[PDB]
Amino acid sequence: FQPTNGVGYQPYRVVVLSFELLHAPATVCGPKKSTNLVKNKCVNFNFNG
Amino acid sequence: DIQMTQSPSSLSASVGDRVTITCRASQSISSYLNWFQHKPGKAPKLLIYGASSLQSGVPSRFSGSGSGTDFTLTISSLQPEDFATYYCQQSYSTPPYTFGQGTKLEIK
Amino acid sequence: EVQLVESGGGLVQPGRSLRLSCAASGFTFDDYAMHWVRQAPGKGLEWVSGISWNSDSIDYADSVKGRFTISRDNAKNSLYLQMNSLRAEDTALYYCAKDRGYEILTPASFDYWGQGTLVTVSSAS
Amino acid sequence: YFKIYSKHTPINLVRDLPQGFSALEPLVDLPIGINITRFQTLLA
Numbered sequence: 274f275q276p277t278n279g280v281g282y283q284p285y286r287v288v289v290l291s292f293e294l295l296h297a298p299a300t301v302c303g304p305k306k307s308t309n310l311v312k313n314k315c316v317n318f319n320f321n322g
Numbered sequence: 323d324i325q326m327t328q329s330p331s332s333l334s335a336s337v338g339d340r341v342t343i344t345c346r347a348s349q350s351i352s353s354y355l356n357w358f359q360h361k362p363g364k365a366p367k368l369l370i371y372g373a374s375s376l377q378s379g380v381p382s383r384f385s386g387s388g389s390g391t392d393f394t395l396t397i398s399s400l401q402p403e404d405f406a407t408y409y410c411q412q413s414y415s416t417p418p419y420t421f422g423q424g425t426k427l428e429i430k
Numbered sequence: 431e432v433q434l435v436e437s438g439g440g441l442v443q444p445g446r447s448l449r450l451s452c453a454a455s456g457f458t459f460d461d462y463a464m465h466w467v468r469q470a471p472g473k474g475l476e477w478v479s480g481i482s483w484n485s486d487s488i489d490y491a492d493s494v495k496g497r498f499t500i501s502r503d504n505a506k507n508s509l510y511l512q513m514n515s516l517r518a519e520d521t522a523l524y525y526c527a528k529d530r531g532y533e534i535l536t537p538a539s540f541d542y543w544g545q546g547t548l549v550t551v552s553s554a555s
Numbered sequence: 556y557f558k559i560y561s562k563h564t565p566i567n568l569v570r571d572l573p574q575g576f577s578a579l580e581p582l583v584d585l586p587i588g589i590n591i592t593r594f595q596t597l598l599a
C-alpha cells in the first residue's frame with residue numbers, strides 16, 4: 274500500500290454485517306417511532322403494540 | 323523534491339465581503355492538501371482536511387476546492403473573528419509535511 | 431476538548447541540551463500518532479519529527495537529523511523530545527500536534543494542536 | 556423467557572413454615588433461550 278498507487282490499488286476498508294433468525298427471543302430492534310399524546314378527543318391509540 | 327507557493331500575502335476586505343486564497347504546488351499531489359487557521363494568540367487549528375472536505379465543528383462558511391496542482395480556499399461571510407494567518411500543507415510527496423508561507427488577512 | 435500542555439522551555443547556551451514534555455488527557459493516547467511542529471519567530475511553520483502509535487517507525491526533519499531524539503511513554507500519556515547540540519537557528523516556538531491516523535507518513539494531517547512553548551538559544555543572563 | 560418472582564416478609568417463626576397469605580410480585584424477565592433441567596444453590 275502506498276499513496277502513489279492508482280485508484281484500483283488503494284486500500285478499501287470493508288465491513289460485512291450478517292443478520293440471523295433462529296429459535297430464540299428477539300433482541301435487536303429498530304428505533305420505535307412515537308407521537309405526541311392527545312386527550313379528550315376520539316383518537317386511534319397504539320400503546321405498546 | 324516539491325515546492326509550495328502562496329500567490330497572496332496580504333489582503334483587505336470588510337465584514338460583508340467574499341475572500342478567496344489560492345495555494346499552488348510544484349508537482350501534482352492528487353487532492354492531498356490541508357488548510358490551517360493560525361490565530362496569532364493561540365494554537366493553530368485545522369479547517370479543511372483533504373481537497374474539499376470540511377472538518378467537524380468549524381463553521382460552514384469556509385469552503386475549499388481544487389485538485390491536481392492548483393487549490394483554492396473560499397470564505398463566504400467574513401465574520402469579524404476570522405482574522406488569522408492561513409497555511410496550506412501537502413502530505414503526498416517524499417519531503418514530509420511541507421508548509422507554505424503565511425497569508426496575512428486583515429479587515430479594513 | 432483534548433488538552434496538550436508543554437513545558438521545559440527556557441534559555442540555554444549554544445551546544446547545551448534540553449528536554450520537552452507534552453501531556454495528553456482528553457483522548458485515547460495509546461493508538462494515535464503525534465508530531466512536533468516548529469514555528470520560527472519570523473517565518474512559517476515547519477515540521478520537525480513524528481512518532482507512530484507504538485515506537486516502531488520514527489522520522490525526522492532533514493535539518494534536525496542526528497540531533498533530535500523523540501520519545502514516547504504510553505503508560506503516563508505523554509511524549510518527550512530530547513533536543514541535543516542546539517545552534518543559534520533553533521530559537522523558535524515548538525508545538526505538540528496530534529496525527530489523525532496511527533502511522534507517521536500518511537495523507538492524514540495534524541488534527542489537534544496545543545499552545546507553543548518558547549525556547550531561546552543565546553548567551554545572556 | 557426466564558422469569559423470577561420475589562417477596563420478602565418478616566416472620567417470627569423458627570422451626571416451621573408460617574401459615575398465611577402473601578402474593579409474589581414479578582422481579583425481572585430474562586429473554587434468553589435456554590433448555591433447562593437442573594439447578595443448584597450457593598452457600599457462603
Ligand SMILES: *[C@@H]1O[C@H](CO)[C@@H](O)[C@H](O)[C@H]1NC(C)=O
Nearest residue numbers: 296297588589590591592593
Ligand atoms: C433443548 O436443549 C436440549 C439440550 O440440553 C436438547 O437436548 C433439546 O433437544 C432441546 N429442545 C429443543 C426443542 O430444541
